[PDB]
Amino acid sequence: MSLVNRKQLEKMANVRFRTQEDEYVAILDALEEYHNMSENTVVEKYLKLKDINSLTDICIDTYKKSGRNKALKKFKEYLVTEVLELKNNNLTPVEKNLHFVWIGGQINDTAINYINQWKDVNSDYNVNVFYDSNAFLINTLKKTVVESAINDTLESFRENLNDPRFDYNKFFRKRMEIIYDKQKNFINYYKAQREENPELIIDDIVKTYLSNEYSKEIDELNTYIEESLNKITQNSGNDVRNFGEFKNGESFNLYEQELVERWNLAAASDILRISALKEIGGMYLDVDMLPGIQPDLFESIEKPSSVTVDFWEMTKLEAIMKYKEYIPEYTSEHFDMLDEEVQSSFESVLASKSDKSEIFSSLGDMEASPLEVKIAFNSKGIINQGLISVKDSYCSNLIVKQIENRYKILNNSLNPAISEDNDFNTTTNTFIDSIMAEANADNGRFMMELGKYLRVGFFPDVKTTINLSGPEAYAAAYQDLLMFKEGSMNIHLIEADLRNFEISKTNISQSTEQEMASLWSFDDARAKAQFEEYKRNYFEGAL
Ligand SMILES: O=c1ccn([C@@H]2O[C@H](COP(=O)(O)OP(=O)(O)O)[C@@H](O)[C@H]2O)c(=O)[nH]1
Ligand SMILES: OC[C@H]1O[C@H](O)[C@H](O)[C@@H](O)[C@@H]1O
Ligand SMILES: [Mn+2]
């Protein structure tokens, strides 16, 4: 399992009558050094392999027709394998912290109920539910602005809505234009207020705005802030405004951009979660994730052949919540579709258990490499709804830097476009023209995903966040690690590469009810059902 020594590499890369060139010798020296590093940190050894890798590339480029290159390229594969060896063999304890994030408003009971299942089965774990005490009204601001735009849009189309099958995309298109205008109005107000009185907090500005523009009662908004603050305080709340390292770092401006300007709480949470992991260590979880089910629990019950795996995984939790009642209002939509015999097998199994510890597994003493961040997987690949990292892991730093470099590219084209104070369509075109002029061979595909940034949260199937602060930033960091580099923009890693960094599937139950409804995005199917909902809501409005 050891990777090659100096002599073994000289045999490999041997070419009769060719002297060892300086750049060849350099690799050889560096390799022997690496084998003298028993007492060094894993990170120190990774950095050595990184330099060995860099010296190998130099040698290859310096002598492109060399009989050594075939073996040198082989040697590079060995370096990667060694990183995985290093990663898999030098494990340190994961700090016993569970980190949840809920920002922008009051947390609901169902989110708390999911959180308590984890608490209930991981008593040795300190729980953080990150919130922003300056920013409990962002969810209200977005809701009010979007509902206002919904109404203005219907009043624009009117009877044209009847006929024929009017293209519902026209609705969301016109509504985006109105949303962009209102949002710009607020952003302009926020910036004017901050520059007039830097002591003002987001919520002060938001409630004044809501009161001025939407005739909201600030007394009521005040009471909601009060209630939200109290509730999260009682539920392991941890204020972002006290997270000093995060506040003073280069990501905080990105966080606030998503929070205050774009109203994208999932993107804001993407930025927060990884800084929390870097700075504190532990395990990050989305509030719609539940503890792993005990593997032995349902073994005696065979999945019917007619039913898919993901369907079966949903019904397991639905079975649990039906008979054990751990979480109020939990759906049994799928469990109920089953044959009565299979339902009986579930209730007989669950009945033979008296404890929640017999139902959900505990996380226990986990360990992972100082090099890595482990990430959840689903049918579509990596997903950052579950993350595991020791404090200050090398990858956590790689991910933070990916996100920041991704936002730097975004904002370089976006800010000038927005500062021309034009409408949605003009702004969009200007921004895309700039994105296009700035794209090259190795970021092209990333750039194609940015063009859509301005509609995030407001138009169906706009998922740009994924490419900016979400899963693609992690894939890119992993490529950084295994490619011995920084700033990868073209992802070429395959599933098997990324599988190296996976969280064991048994540590998380992903197929939950709340996971089936995205809070920051919505698909075409959902867009259609919203649009018709809005049509009928409005018609019933004579009240
Ligand atoms: O109003 C909100 C909505 C979302 N989130 C955060 O965004 C995460 C991702 O939400 P969701 O699971 O809906 O995203 P998805 O898995 O559908 O991409 C949540 O767990 C929260 O951390 C938040 O803090 N406030
Ligand atoms: O990156 C956008 C989103 O991607 C994934 O769907 C994760 O579930 C979510 O937590 C994240 O916010
Ligand atoms: Mn989710």
Instruction: Specify the 3-state DSSP secondary structure of 229.
Output: helix
Tell me the CATH number of domain 5-90, given options 3.40.50.410, 3.30.70.260, 1.10.10.60, 1.20.58.1190.
1.20.58.1190
Q: How far apart, in whole angstroms, are the C-alpha atoms of residue 316 and residue 318? A: 5
Phi–psi pair at 140, nearest 5 degrees: -60, -45
Measure the CA angle with vertex 433, ends 428 and 436; round to 5°.
Answer: 120
Instruction: List the one residue out of 216, 46, 247, 17 whose CA is nearest residue 130.
Output: 247
Q: How far apart, in whole angstroms, are the C-alpha atoms of residue 157 and residue 163? A: 10
Protein residue whose Cα sits closest to atom 20 of ligand 1: 286
For residues 96-114, one letter each, b for 16 or more C-beta atoms within 10 angstroms of the residue's C-beta and e for the rest, the string is: bbbbbbbbbbbbeebbbbb
Would you say how long the chain is, in residues?
Answer: 543
Q: How far apart, in whole angstroms, are the C-alpha atoms of residue 186 and residue 213? A: 9
* Amino acid sitting at position 200: L
What are the structure tokens assigned to 271, written together? Answer: 């930025």
* Amino acid sitting at position 535: K
The residue to which tokens 């330099």 are assigned:
51
Write 188-194 long-range contacts (CB < 8 A, 24+).
Answer: 190/260, 190/261
Does ligand 1 have an atom closer than 6 angstroms to the CB of 265?
Answer: yes
Q: How far apart, in whole angstroms, are the C-alpha atoms of residue 288 and residue 108? A: 12
* Amino acid sitting at position 43: V
Q: How far apart, in whole angstroms, are the C-alpha atoms of residue 69 and residue 37? A: 27
> Domain extents for the chain?
5-90, 91-292+362-543, 293-361
Residue 129's alpha-carbon distances to 117, 256, 297, 327, 360, in angstroms, are 14, 18, 29, 19, 21
Q: Are 299 and 352 in contact (CB under 8 A)?
A: no
Q: Are 116 and 98 in contact (CB under 8 A)?
A: no
Instruction: List the one residue out of 482, 426, 493, 483 whose CA is nearest residue 454.
Output: 426
Cα of 458 vs centre of ligand 3, distance in Å, is: 17
Q: Which method, experimentally, gave rise to this model?
A: X-ray
Q: How far apart, in whole angstroms, are the C-alpha atoms of residue 125 and residue 131? A: 19
Does ligand 2 have an atom closer than 6 angstroms to the CB of 301?
Answer: no
Please choose from 290, 453, 466 the residue to mutate so as to test ligand 2's pocket, defined by most ligand atoms within 8 A of CB.
Answer: 466
Q: Are 118 and 90 in contact (CB under 8 A)?
A: no
Say if strands 282-285 and 381-389 run parallel, antiparallel, or are unpaired.
antiparallel
Q: Is 336 annotated as a binding residue?
A: no
Q: How far apart, in whole angstroms, are the C-alpha atoms of residue 218 and residue 453? A: 32
Q: Is 137 annotated as a binding residue?
A: no
Protein residue whose Cα sits closest to atom 12 of ligand 2: 266
Instruction: Specify the 3-state DSSP secondary structure of 37.
Output: coil
Does ligand 1 have an atom closer than 6 angstroms to the CB of 456?
Answer: no
Protein residue whose Cα sits closest to atom 17 of ligand 1: 518
Measure the CA angle with vertex 352, ends 348 and 353; round to 5°.
Answer: 125
For ligand 3, a single-atom ion, the residues with CB < 5 A are: 286, 288, 515
The DSSP element (H or E) to which 46 belongs, if any, is helix 42-62
Protein residue whose Cα sits closest to atom 10 of ligand 2: 385
Q: How far apart, in whole angstroms, are the C-alpha atoms of residue 373 and residue 383? A: 12
What are the structure tokens assigned to 478, written together? Answer: 């992993």
Q: Matching CATH topology for 5-90 and 293-361?
A: no
Q: How far apart, in whole angstroms, are the C-alpha atoms of residue 48 and residue 51? A: 5
Q: Is 520 annotated as a binding residue?
A: yes
Q: Are 498 and 384 in contact (CB under 8 A)?
A: no
Distance separating the N- and C-terminal Cα atoms of the chain = 74
Write out 319-383 in H/E/C secondary structure: HHHHHHCCCCCCCCCCHHHCCHHHHHHHHHHHHCCCCHHHCECCCCCCEECCCCCEEEEECCEEE
CATH number for the segment(s) 293-361: 1.10.10.1780
Please choose from 101, 127, 290, 520 the residue to mutate so as to test ligand 1's pocket, defined by most ligand atoms within 8 A of CB.
Answer: 520
Ligand nearest the Cα atom of residue 269? 1
Phi–psi pair at 252, nearest 5 degrees: -65, -35
What are the structure tokens assigned to 209, written together? Answer: 């705005």
